[PDB]
Amino acid sequence: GSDGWTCAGSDFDGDQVRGQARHWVDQQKTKFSDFQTHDGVQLCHFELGEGNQLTQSFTGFRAYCDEPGDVYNVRYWDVSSRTWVLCTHYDIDF
Numbered sequence: 001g002s003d004g005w006t007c008a009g010s011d012f013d014g015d016q017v018r019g020q021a022r023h024w025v026d027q028q029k030t031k032f033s034d035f036q037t038h039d040g041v042q043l044c045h046f047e048l049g050e051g052n053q054l055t056q057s058f059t060g061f062r063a064y065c066d067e068p069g070d071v072y073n074v075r076y077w078d079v080s081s082r083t084w085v086l087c088t089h090y091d092i093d094f
Helices: 014-027
Strands: 002-007 010-013 031-036 042-047 061-065 071-078 083-086 088-092
Touching: 002 014, 002 071, 010 014, 014 042, 014 061, 014 071, 031 061
Parallel strands: none
Antiparallel strands: 002 010, 002 088, 031 042, 042 061, 061 071, 071 083
16 A cells, blocks of 8 residues: 655655654644644644655645644645645555
8 A cells, every 4th residue: 555645746655744744743843733633633734845855944835743743634835826725645555
């Protein structure tokens, strides 16, 4: 199995996103977001780098975690709409 997110034209590998998340949670340096899960839990985000790259700077992509640290969703910044748009999670089973 493999998984990931598709953000309009950009692909992110699930394990790579989760690796970044593990780091920022461990660091206690996720950031308060304006978004919540479907269950009402407040999400914190980090700036999502390409590959395994770790960054605190805007990339146009954010991943969102709950307090236990799990990645819930990924968004991309849409310049035309001036909003953070949900990316689509995909799961591939072989």
